[model samples]
Target: SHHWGYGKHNGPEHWHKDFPIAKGERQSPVDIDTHTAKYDPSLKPLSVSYDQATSLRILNNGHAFNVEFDDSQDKAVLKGGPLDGTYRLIQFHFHWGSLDGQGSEHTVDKKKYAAELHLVHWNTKYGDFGKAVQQPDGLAVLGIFLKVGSAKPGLQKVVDVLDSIKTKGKSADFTNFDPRGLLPESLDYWTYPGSLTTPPLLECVTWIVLKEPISVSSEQVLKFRKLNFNGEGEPEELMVDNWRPAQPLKNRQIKASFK
Candidate 1:
């Protein structure tokens, strides 16, 4: 009833009834202890669609670049395999901790990847993610782990434009970059039926997690640490801590596919 609870004690533990799904189920921040390694993810360099990002609308949502892509560019992934319905590229964004050394999606053996890039997609099959969310397999995300190390050419493209937002909820139109280029060449991803990592935690996700990681420079990562949103029009939140502190892994197990 209230933001925390109906009465007395507030916070997560007391609000169990508020989220029926999480009440009796497992979540993320899983130990990553279990492993099957069933899939033999391809180990090779992949191709990026263009040299620049297009239909790229960067918004300083106080949180970070809440960038969105138009469905009009549906042919990109629809060129061949997968689902038969029209799937649109809804948005592509990033998640990170306040420190460059932390933040990640699925952890490997309990270690957090420097950063995680998520490209959120909606299956136009049921005619868009909003309506599709009700369906068990309504969404898809391409997850790529980022690490700080040697200078990466692919990452350089985004760094040059870091100044655009440098603040919160700021936005700008990006061009001349093939957003797809950022994806790891190895499509032999870990595919598993799961839920959206955040609230409304819908379990209708078809995830494609690349086996290979994209490398970034130490200097590049420092840019993320400078993230600030304590100013106006900001999300009241900032990028330094834009992650959901991974949930627990329920009964569902993640699976991988081989090349």
Candidate 2:
């Protein structure tokens, strides 16, 4: 039915056929034009707290490798900076290109990064992810851009386990890894109303995209490309360029936390 993918035949351009919300007003991964982004003095610093033990497992979900978290409690949560209440971290994933120059889903001044990391969190006030996803303020996703340069020790921790989840649906025990290590030194970000980059394309996300980017070695990105999109016993297809192109901004204002 709605088996969407990042391929020429079933990519973002064709997503509107199955998930009509792809053409919605608040679509995600919009290009952030720094010249046009408005600086907001009222935006507070982002508050992020993560419990190392909250990390559960890592899996290759066909589209991207994800590190799932134990969201049963408020162990790993985010607050402040364009957020009303606490949001629990559920899962984190990434999107990348075959090459280092263009992989990130969100762009800045039309410049693409090597990759992009998305830390998915659901508002606690709504009880759970399923219920919260239906509300406009249901989700808050932190988008961190990855630049190709020096090797990041925290990212190395994740890249080291890539061999285990080489194919689709493959997973392994991954715990005690704090996601804070993946964030940039600066918390300055751009905020906007958007939707999930992937299907069901629900316009229920408040996107917080960091201005600064963390570093990842070119060798590390090569490992990400090694993962296969197809499952075991299926035709092998490298899982590269899984990012959706930047969508239209429409009638939205991009707010920046810093001057």
* Number of the top TM-score candidate: 2
Task: Give the top-scoring candidate (lDDT).
Answer: 2
Lowest summed lDDT across 10 adjacent residues in model 1 is found at 43-52
lDDT (C-alpha) at residue 142 in model 2: 94
Residue 231 accuracy (lDDT) in model 1: 54
CA error at residue 65 for candidate 2, angstroms: 1.0
lDDT computed for candidate 2: 0.93
For 98-168, candidate 2 gives per-residue lDDT tens digits of 98899999999999999999999999999999999999999999999999999988888899999999999
Candidate 2, residue 219: the lDDT equals: 92
Model 1 scores what on Cα lDDT? 0.60
